[PDB]
Amino acid sequence: SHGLFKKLGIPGPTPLPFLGNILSYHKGFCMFDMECHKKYGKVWGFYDGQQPVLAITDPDMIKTVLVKECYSVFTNRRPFGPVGFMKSAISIAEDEEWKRLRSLLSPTFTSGKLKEMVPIIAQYGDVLVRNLRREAETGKPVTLKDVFGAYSMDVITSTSFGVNIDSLNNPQDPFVENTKKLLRFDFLDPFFLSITVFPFLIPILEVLNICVFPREVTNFLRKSVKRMKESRLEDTDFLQLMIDSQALSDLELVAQSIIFIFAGYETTSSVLSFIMYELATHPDVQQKLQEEIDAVLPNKAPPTYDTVLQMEYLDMVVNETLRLFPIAMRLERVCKKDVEINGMFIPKGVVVMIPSYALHRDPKYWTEPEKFLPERFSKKNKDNIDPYIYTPFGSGPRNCIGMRFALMNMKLALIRVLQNFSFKPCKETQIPLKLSLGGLLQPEKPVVLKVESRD
Numbered sequence: 001s002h003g004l005f006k007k008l009g010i011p012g013p014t015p016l017p018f019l020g021n022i023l024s025y026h027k028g029f030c031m032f033d034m035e036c037h038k039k040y041g042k043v044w045g046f047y048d049g050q051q052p053v054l055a056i057t058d059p060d061m062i063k064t065v066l067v068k069e070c071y072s073v074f075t076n077r078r079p080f081g082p083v084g085f086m087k088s089a090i091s092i093a094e095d096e097e098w099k100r101l102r103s104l105l106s107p108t109f110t111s112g113k114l115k116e117m118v119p120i121i122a123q124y125g126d127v128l129v130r131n132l133r134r135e136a137e138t139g140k141p142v143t144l145k146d147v148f149g150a151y152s153m154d155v156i157t158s159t160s161f162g163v164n165i166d167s168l169n170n171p172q173d174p175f176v177e178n179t180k181k182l183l184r185f186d187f188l189d190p191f192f193l194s195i196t197v198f199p200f201l202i203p204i205l206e207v208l209n210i211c212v213f214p215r216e217v218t219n220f221l222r223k224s225v226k227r228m229k230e231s232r233l234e235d236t237d238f239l240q241l242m243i244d245s246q247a248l249s250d251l252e253l254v255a256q257s258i259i260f261i262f263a264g265y266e267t268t269s270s271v272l273s274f275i276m277y278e279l280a281t282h283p284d285v286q287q288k289l290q291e292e293i294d295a296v297l298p299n300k301a302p303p304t305y306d307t308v309l310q311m312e313y314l315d316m317v318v319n320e321t322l323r324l325f326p327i328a329m330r331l332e333r334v335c336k337k338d339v340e341i342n343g344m345f346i347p348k349g350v351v352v353m354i355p356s357y358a359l360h361r362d363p364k365y366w367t368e369p370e371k372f373l374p375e376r377f378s379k380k381n382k383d384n385i386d387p388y389i390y391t392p393f394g395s396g397p398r399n400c401i402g403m404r405f406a407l408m409n410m411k412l413a414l415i416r417v418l419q420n421f422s423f424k425p426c427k428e429t430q431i432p433l434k435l436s437l438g439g440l441l442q443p444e445k446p447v448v449l450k451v452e453s454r455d
């Protein structure tokens with residue numbers, strides 16, 4: 001397989017037998033991708049074991065992959081390891097199985113439903129605020145990821161079966177304790193390295209029932225969803241709309257819910273911590289934002305759907321943080337069949353990969369790409385921004401279905417958090433921040449910050 005890119009005249013790093021290029025992942029996905037763009041230009045190919053991956057950076061070609069020929073060629077992603085029943089999770093499903101689940105779960109994130117969560121997730125804003133105060137008179141650096149973690153868990157749980165939890169103040173609630181494994185899902189463990197060199201071993205793991213998703217969790221939710229289906233509401237949000245529309249197996253319902261529990265927890269939490277790092281290392285941006293909030297919501301007023309979209313600088317700050325720290329790092333699609341996009345021929349079976357992280361830090365689009373500058377995203381400057389270079393939620397029919405929910409939910413956290421506190425660096429604060437060793441962006445060391453109340 002290692003002769004494909006030579007034969008197609010596409011440049012790239014020299015593959016070793018069996019391994020392909022995987023040894024290059026030792027400097028991390030981010031450095032590997034940056035270095036490849038730098039020295040190969042617009043397009044290159046590499047091997048994840050025997051799997052050919054073709055990197056693209058042309059905004060049109062990108063638009064052809066993600067938008068135009070999605071349904072007909074570039075419809076699916078590549079799974080990593082034994083996935084078991086999670087074969088039917090929206091995120092992992094393929095072709096018609098996927099299209100059905102997407103159409104089915106479309107209506108979850110309508111602006112109507114979005115409006116209906118504001119008041120629910122408000123309740124957990126207050127809980128967050130309280131937890132943040134008690135942690136601040138500690139006078140000792142605060143692990144935000146922990147505090148934010150608790151918040152975003154609580155929010156999405158309620159967005160399914162209003163199963164209310166204090167998280168922090170309930171480390172034992174069956175729903176909290178048991179879902180603890182579903183992240184830390186170790187995206188960094190060598191098993192994913194091995195399984196890429198030995199993808200031929202996956203069907204052996206499937207047959208033995210070994211699954212990358214902990215058995216403990218799958219088992220909790222199958223019975224949880226059983227109960228909240230019958231027991232909890234047999235008299236007369238996401239979960240409901242799953243049952244209400246019943247061909248959707250209960251096993252496939254758990255599939256979606258696990259995707260949602262994970263995504264709703266890690267994304268929100270990790271992004272909010274990158275954002276507060278950036279506000280703490282830029283006090284002026286922090287105050288400027290604190291002023292916008294106080295102007296739009298006078299006297300610590302409660303945020304509403306309409307006021308949240310009203311906050312331009314807030315949007316600017318969130319957008320810019322996601323430019324520097326797009327947690328997905330790469331976008332990927334499997335080429336279903338032979339094609340010629342924008343001139344170049346892609347053969348069946350290649351994974352076409354868009355290196356988001358590199359693109360978000362590419363000099364040809366970004367002045368001082370390394371610096372946190374929200375001005376970049378002001379209404380008179382955002383014209384200069386290509387929606388196929390900046391893509392923190394992907395693009396096209398298979399983009400982040402949770403985009404508007406995430407944004408919304410992150411802002412509601414910020415607005416409540418900045419209404420009451422200010423955030424400042426200290427000793428245990430890592431400056432400059434160092435990124436996760438691998439494929440899902442996380443901080444190297446947990447983000448720790450000083451928190452002062454505003455009276």
Ligand code: HEM
Nearest residue numbers: 090091263264267328392393394395398399400401402406
């Ligand atoms: C700010 C945090 C988040 C970021 C940066 C983010 C980013 C992404 C990106 C880049 C993709 C890939 C799309 C593509 O390939 O073009 C994606 C897929 C997806 N995301 Fe989001 N996401 C976030 C939060 C969420 C939330 C809150 C949910 C839902 C509760 C969610 C559910 C999904 C699902 C289900 C997919 C697979 C989509 C499909 O195959 O139909 N993510 N996420």
Ligand SMILES: CC(C)c1nc(CN(C)C(=O)N[C@H](C(=O)NCCCCNC(=O)OCc2cncs2)C(C)C)cs1
Nearest residue numbers: 077078079080081091092185212259262328330331332
């Ligand atoms: C539920 C959560 C813990 C997840 N675990 C995984 C890991 N597993 C088991 C996979 O097979 N993942 C596969 C995977 O990691 N793809 C290869 C790298 C893709 C790089 N881009 C990338 O990560 O895009 C973000 C997303 C894509 N889909 C959902 S989020 C895909 C099916 C997402 C994906 S989402």
Ligand SMILES: CC(C)c1nc(CN(C)C(=O)N[C@H](C(=O)NCCCCNC(=O)OCc2cncs2)C(C)C)cs1
Nearest residue numbers: 025048080187188189190192193196263328438439440
């Ligand atoms: C783990 C590390 C040792 C290595 N993995 C590899 C294999 N490669 C190239 C991979 O792409 N690996 C995979 C990978 O890093 N995938 C990227 C993360 C995908 C998981 N989820 C994810 O992307 O979440 C963001 C979301 C947005 N909306 C909902 S979730 C696997 C670790 C799942 C080489 S070295």
